Amino acid sequence: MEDYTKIEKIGEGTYGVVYKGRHKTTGQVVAMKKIRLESEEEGVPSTAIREISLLKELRHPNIVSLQDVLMQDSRLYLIFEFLSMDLKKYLDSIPPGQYMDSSLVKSYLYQILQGIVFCHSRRVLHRDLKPQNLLIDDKGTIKLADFGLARAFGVYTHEVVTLWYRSPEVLLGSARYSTPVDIWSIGTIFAELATKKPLFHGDSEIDQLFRIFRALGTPNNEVWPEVESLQDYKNTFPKWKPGSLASHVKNLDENGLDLLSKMLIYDPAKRISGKMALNHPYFND
Amino acid sequence: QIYYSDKYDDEEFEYRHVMLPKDIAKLVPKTHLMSESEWRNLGVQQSQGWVHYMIHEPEPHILLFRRPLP
């Protein structure tokens, strides 16, 4: 805080208290996350910071560059560029009856894909991806925030937005997860960009699964190998056929629907990758 | 107080779920499903023949109910 004046409080983004500030040398306006660290044991060196150190490196135009990191008395300041808009906010601001211009959707998705491919690419996930994490500048550029912060760390309706953008691997209690979770989230976001509505709007983990199934069909081993072995799979689930996805979403040409369908494949080994998605016919304009 | 979902269905059953206040899920049996008497006692109000048919272990306060169709 030598180099920075606190201007004002601006929320509590899952990790810290978030503040607005200014760099006293460069006059730069910034977003500051203040994070109180758990006291650590003697030898045990903190992997949390190791991670953050590494995340400081990452620059890419479609990610929110983490500019600096600072240490006060056992507390940690994450310094980011200051953006005043996010996509949740944006979508809310659209008047009723109007929709997001379908070429702007396409723009936005590509930019989002680029940022994630970059991250992925660098061995780094989001995990908790969702519209309030996708920031925007006046220049019309969109940027991922909070990439890899989950990894570096680890009440309950704080969880229950996060639920709508969450992969069925994670929901069914899958032993391990990887880059496919971020693509799932991006698929759910894609649908929302078109419709203005969350796609899978569940009230609980279990209702979230059921919502997904009502639209994509209840999974079994035919469609998702080894699925019936997951800790929270049950043979008692309701039995919906697929599903019937154009049904659930308007304002996408066949390309959009197809790309989308590929982002929401159950089997994570079979689900589209960030890179492939950037070559889909959908992006030709 | 207790939240009751809208209803939903297969071709085979109809379904709904009920969310209990947290507090009370201490006392939802973990290793078996509940008789009609058993769940009514928790204060669940519903017509006859709804069957407690599964548990989502990480959300044990959510009772899942199912009843056959025609």
Numbering used by the authors:
A (entry chain A): 1 to 154, 159 to 289
B (entry chain B): 5 to 74
Publication passage describing the model:
CDK1 is the founding member of the cyclin-dependent protein kinase (CDK) family and was first purified as a component of maturation promoting factor from unfertilized Xenopus eggs1. CDK1 is the only CDK to partner cyclin B, which starts to accumulate in S-phase10. Activation of CDK1–cyclin B, first detected at centrosomes, signals the onset of mitosis, and CDK1 complexes of both cyclin A and B are required to ensure its successful completion. In this paper we describe the crystal structure of monomeric CDK1 bound to Cks1 and the structures of a ternary CDK1–cyclin B–Cks2 complex in the apo form bound to a potent CDK1 inhibitor.
The CDK1–Cks1 complex crystallizes with four CDK1–Cks1 heterodimers in the asymmetric unit to yield a lattice with large interfaces between the CDK1–Cks1 pairs. Monomeric CDK1 adopts a classical bi-lobal protein kinase fold that is in an inactive conformation. The C-helix of the N-terminal lobe is displaced out of the active site cleft and the non-phosphorylated activation segment (defined as the sequence between the conserved D146FG and SPE173 motifs) does not adopt a conformation capable of peptide substrate recognition. The character of the CDK1 active site cleft beyond the ATP phosphate-binding site is shaped by residues 40–46 that precede the start of the C-helix and adopt an unusual extended hairpin. This structure originates in the peculiar geometries accessible to G43 and P45, and its conformation is probably dictated by lattice contacts. Like CDK2, the CDK1 glycine-rich loop is mobile, while residues 156–162, which form the core of the activation segment, do not have supporting electron density in any CDK1 molecule. At the start of the activation segment, the Cα positions of the DFG motif align closely with those of CDK2 and both kinases then adopt a short α-helical structure (αL12) that displaces the C-helix from the active site. The only difference between CDK1 and CDK2 in this region is the location of the DFG phenylalanine sidechain: in the CDK1 structure F147 is rotated back towards the carbonyl moiety of V64, whereas in CDK2 it points into the active site towards D185. Beyond the activation segment the CDK1 C-terminal lobe is well-ordered adopting an all α-helical structure to which Cks1 binds. However, starting at L290, the CDK1 sequence is disordered in all four ncs-related CDK1 molecules.
